[PDB]
Design a protein around this ligand. Structure first.
Ligand SMILES: O=C1N/C(=N/c2ccccc2Cl)S/C1=C\c1ccc(O)c([N+](=O)[O-])c1
Length: 266
């Protein structure tokens, strides 16, 4: 069914390879996850939650990665995922190009917000929003959310489990090992937006996160700084909602994805 290509990445959430669907030469990604590292299971048969979550967000909307198929092996699960070509993740993009212009960051952040709003609307919490988990369709200027391997079903009660990225985690998790989905998601969005406009994350140590003092190492507008400091409110209830973020003055007059490519990506 699939012609396997080179390894696109390896880590805690498995190994991911480049692939070709022999049927129509469709570009795909082949993700392998060891069953022994899957703590969360669900159904709709017994599959990892990642498969469950991915099928809930599966749609015609292109802000979230698409699950094409999956397979069960004796000791692993194999995910066949959408693969844009060419593509580059936000981490490598910022790593090679540095801090993004606010016009480009606005377009990107907007697309991320629309994707996470989609997940939440579908009952899914991603729980690992970051530059590494965002793909860029370089031709269409469209962003895609990837890696749902640390995500859970969205709920209104407290989460006592977390296995996402620590430097993107909120101060309520660091201290109390407790967080609520939406507020915690907004925090990671604040970390992400800072990362976009400054070229790196604001906090590296637990002590910095608890304190939540944001220092700008780059020239950033007052409105962007405001939105960032707002998302990074210590008290979760002082954090904006997704509506309040997208009605923020800095989020005004966003570029269409195709405009974003012709100006910034070509
Ligand atoms: O849903 C997903 N979870 C992922 N996790 C990983 C992320 C980094 C390294 C290894 C793994 Cl398994 S990758 C992934 C989807 C992708 C789909 C297409 C694609 O080109 C890529 N990519 O380039 O890494 C990734």
């Amino acid at each position: 069914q699939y012609q396997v290509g080179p390894l696109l990445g390896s880590g805690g959430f498995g190994s991911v390879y480049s692939g070709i669907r022999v049927s129509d030469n469709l570009p795909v990604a082949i993700k392998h996850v060891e069953k022994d590292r899957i703590s969360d299971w669900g159904e709709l048969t017994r599959v990892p939650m990642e498969v469950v979550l991915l099928k809930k967000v599966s749609s015609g909307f292109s802000g979230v990665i698409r699950l094409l198929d999956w397979f069960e092996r004796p000791d692993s699960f194999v995910l066949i995922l959408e693969r844009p070509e060419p593509v580059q993740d936000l981490f490598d993009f910022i790593t090679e190009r540095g801090a993004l212009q606010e016009e480009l960051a606005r377009s990107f952040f907007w697309q991320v917000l629309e994707a996470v709003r989609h997940c939440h609307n579908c009952g899914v919490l991603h729980r690992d929003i970051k530059d590494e988990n965002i793909l860029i369709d370089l031709n269409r200027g469209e962003l895609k959310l990837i890696d749902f391997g640390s995500g859970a079903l969205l709920k209104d009660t407290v989460y006592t489990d977390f296995d996402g990225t620590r430097v993107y985690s909120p101060p309520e998790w660091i201290r109390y090992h407790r967080y609520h989905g939406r507020s915690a998601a907004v925090w990671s969005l604040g970390i992400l937006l800072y990362d976009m406009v400054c070229g790196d994350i604001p906090f590296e140590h637990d002590e910095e996160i608890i304190r939540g003092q944001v220092f700008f190492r780059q020239r950033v507008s007052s409105e962007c700084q405001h939105l960032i400091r707002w998302c990074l409110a210590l008290r979760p209830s002082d954090r904006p909602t997704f509506e309040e973020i997208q009605n923020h003055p800095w989020m005004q007059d966003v570029l269409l994805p195709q405009e974003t490519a012709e100006i910034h990506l070509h």
